Design a protein around this ligand. Structure first.
Ligand SMILES: NC[C@@H](c1ccccc1)N1CCc2c(-c3cccnc3)csc2C1=O
Ligand SMILES: NC[C@@H](c1ccccc1)N1CCc2c(-c3cccnc3)csc2C1=O
Ligand SMILES: NC[C@@H](c1ccccc1)N1CCc2c(-c3cccnc3)csc2C1=O
Ligand SMILES: NC[C@@H](c1ccccc1)N1CCc2c(-c3cccnc3)csc2C1=O
Lengths: 296, 294, 296, 294
């Protein structure tokens, strides 16, 4: 029986103690507290020594899957995710349509803050974020010669492209330390996204295919890669931001952060019903970023 | 302007007048009234003969895309979607992970109502219950088909994509209750790049160790879905449940979901569970023009 | 074990059968089906003969409380609620701030449909509804002489005003068969609303009190009235639209229709998670309106 | 304009920089950054001395109204609210049914964490658990006070309103953990016309048969709350949880709730559970200026 009790500001302001007190505050603050515990248990299992997939990445004592929706990549959470990937704190990335190109585009031009007329200035609104159309034009220019090389390598060097191999290539090509995908390919963290071509990147692949036909993207090889990662893990952890990212039907540790409801049936595990833009950086602050020394 | 006024039940229970009166009721009832008009405009456009200049599955005056999340296929809305597809009322289907297998499995065994399990072997989707045995029955049915598909790839040069696989599964289920049976029979393509994210995917995965090499290309499906939009005279969209399609326009569009805008996740949005709204929408729109589609 | 099955439009369009099939469709459609059952069981218990509070209203075999938020009174649901009250199908009304005056004002001037600049034309927006400010001005003019009479009767005829007695008086004064509150006082259905003065009606009572001081509105007498209604019922039914209307901590039958979530802890019973503007008229169509003959 | 950029944890865990960076992070993080600015503007205004012309519980340069739903008083946010009230950082409280008694009951017995009962005697509020015995303890404490209040009404001519009752309950609880103890001690009025809708109301009801005639007038409270706004130099509002106050303006305003607009139920709205957000907001605003309020 733990008693409900909030942080007492008559102590002054200690941010560690403030965040610890969320555990006893109730409602989603308590879920936040439980999420910190689950992620710290993931991390501690990951750091336990081993003494013991078609993948280069060395096995650890806990394989952590980080899933996220595109919109979080458009947000500043992109920096949070990049940090984790940069320091090898997760093992596999999963995302949805848009989630690749929104990272790469931010390397060529910035996304801006607006609010919750726009079409005439040439601007794509995503919540309270603004991406000028010019950004997609710059990305297109950058992308075309890479797709040319990709088709050539497929037809002459036997390369069998999948979304994950394409995402590694694009990460390598962007060659920029602010990119999630640059760091992911550098650290051999595979990125999975069958819905890679559903949005803007798809549109460009589509037009490119009439200029230079031939590109094939197989999803069955990626299917084998992602599932083998899970089957041959000693333990698995999952952290999933935004929902609609991953399917069930076991994970040893699981945290979900989203604002989706269960009532229209839309797809000790912990859910925090909150905007990940608020919650994820706090969660990282109290977990992965506390163990920064151990990952180096 | 138009005055707010609900239906007056002193007039008795006149269902058509009641549904019409939603338009002036306000909030999401008003949006439902607008959805009805939007869908009726699509249908009117569709039934319009192509003029001499507009000429080109045969193209109509309005190409209608129907998108839905897999949860709706688990629900009884599966029957509503099947009705529209059976009667050629839509031209293209788009769905999400689970959206295919959940239709096929219901031909082999029923889904049940529970409430809002792991030991009895039950998969819970909201208040719906699918016994785990349903998926075992599906596995048995599917494996021989996957053998045939790999054989045809390797010896007949068939290049599989998700749409072609879904067409083939529909032909193989050969059951008039199935959405996918009717889609392939009527040459309505089904697009679903996340086809392998769920249980069907687990099965294709395991199958690939006994009999490797199946390739599912998404790029040919990318070209097919986009060309449907590009060569349409007019386009209509009806998207149920959210997370199905991406923008960056349709001439007519209706979205029905309870997704929020605040975390960043004349078109009409109805903020409601599609399980309530979509059959009412269909009753006032497609079902009124049933004979025109026969 | 009931099997999931939707309405089959190859039968054509039978609206009764369509609505019955919601029961087996799943998700909130199934909850809708369960709500129809609960309300029909309320009604059937109400119609059972008796052979057996400080209130004139005769006891029946089930006392039905109908609760609703103001916004539903601004909507066309006002007509649905009025119908029930007109035909004595419920016994007690409960509402929130705004819920009284939005009915009365619609008797003097209409509310309009807008969408989800407005201040300069003089317009109060409520979701996609528009109420011109002029409507509140007309209501104020109408209200002042009634408040004058009310203060006089308090100080000379011993009248002890409560929100429910005030609401009866206003219903009687509006004298219009489109008003919920006209019908409620005519049929001796009490209306409870401690938060009666939180909005526009309150503002006007506030200004009036400097022109004609003295008005007292006691909530303790109303507290006694509403609770005695419940204590001395043979059976109770509750139908509550919009949430935040009533408090718990027993009802024999209960239906709630709202879109509030349980996750931030905001306050066989059935919940339908839906906009009552869609759901309530359908529910009425399949329940109270089917038994219209028996209530006359 | 401002570029989207999250906090970079390569800089280490610098909490102040992290909270500041929410402003450029986007979605509701950006709204949190705007709430911080809005509340800091209120506080800055409040600490501004009244000029010679502006002169008139003593009035300040900004009158701040703090509103909250009772669920927040059941939560640990009760401590946060109590802190602000204890230190005269707000001028008026407004709450909803349950909002009073749930503070008072915690002085007699604790609330507990459970998960998202009727036989053990437990009231469930989300993932919070209040044993039914807590309310029995509250009843015992309250009855003698209700006797005194009726006596003073009838023999001393006291005219009770909810605010006066809440002040009196706060004085009687005489406990520094209580929001209402500090409100009456600092002459912060508490308004709550729905005071009797819940458990306190059940108790006043039963008490009224043994000892009848208590009158709680809301009209005098109506005048008091409105006059606080009318005579303010500047007004600020902080409203947690929704359904608390009605409009038809404040100079500064922040709302924190997860209510939707679609059913119809420079001000800033943060769409989030206040149990996460409000203590962070307070840490960056009122708690930085603690000494100015002492
Ligand atoms: N059902 C198993 C489940 C899972 C989750 C986590 C670890 C292991 C297994 N799963 C595997 C397949 C998958 C794909 C995907 C990607 C590229 C090609 N094909 C499919 C995207 S999401 C998703 C998914 O959820
Ligand atoms: N961005 C354009 C947009 C669109 C929608 C509707 C008509 C035209 C164009 N689009 C096209 C591609 C697509 C796929 C998909 C399917 C199979 C392979 N690759 C991709 C699933 S959803 C989706 C989508 O939203
Ligand atoms: N807790 C008992 C509960 C209840 C509900 C239903 C039937 C009986 C009892 N209750 C009674 C009191 C009440 C008031 C109110 C109204 C005018 C004056 N004072 C209080 C508004 S809502 C509300 C409420 O929920
Ligand atoms: N409509 C004006 C609005 C307002 C808010 C803030 C400052 C000024 C004015 N208002 C004033 C009245 C009020 C009551 C209340 C309390 C005790 C007795 N009667 C009514 C509770 S909430 C509420 C409210 O919202």
């Amino acid at each position: 029986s733990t008693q409900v009790r909030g942080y007492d500001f008559n102590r002054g302001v200690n941010y560690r103690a403030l965040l610890e007190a969320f555990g006893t505050t109730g409602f989603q603050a308590t879920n936040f507290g439980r999420a910190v515990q689950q992620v710290n248990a993931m991390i501690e299992k990951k750091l336990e020594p081993l003494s013991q997939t078609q993948s280069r990445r060395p096995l650890t004592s806990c394989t952590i899957f980080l899933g996220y929706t595109s919109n979080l990549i458009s947000s500043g959470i992109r920096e949070t995710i990049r940090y984790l990937v940069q320091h090898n704190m997760v093992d596999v990335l999963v995302t949805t349509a848009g989630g690749v190109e929104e990272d790469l585009i931010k390397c060529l031009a910035p996304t801006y803050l607006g609010e919750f007329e726009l079409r005439e200035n040439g601007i794509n609104r995503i919540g309270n974020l603004l991406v000028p159309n010019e950004n997609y034009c710059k990305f297109e220019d950058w992308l075309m010669p890479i797709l040319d090389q990709m088709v050539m390598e497929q037809n002459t060097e036997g390369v069998k492209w999948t979304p994950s191999k394409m995402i590694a290539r694009l990460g390598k090509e962007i060659n920029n330390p602010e990119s999630v995908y640059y760091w992911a390919q550098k650290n051999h963290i595979p990125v999975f996204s069958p819905a890679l071509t559903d949005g803007s990147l798809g549109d460009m692949i589509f037009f490119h295919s009439y200029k230079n036909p031939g590109l094939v993207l197989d999803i069955v090889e990626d299917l084998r890669l992602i599932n083998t990662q899970a089957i041959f893990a000693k333990c698995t952890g999952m952290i999933i931001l935004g929902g609609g990212v991953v399917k069930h039907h076991g994970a040893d540790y699981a945290v979900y952060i989203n604002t989706a409801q269960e009532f229209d049936g839309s797809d000790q595990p912990v859910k925090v019903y909150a905007d990940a833009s608020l919650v994820f950086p706090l969660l990282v602050a109290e977990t992965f970023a506390q163990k920064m020394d151990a990952f180096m």
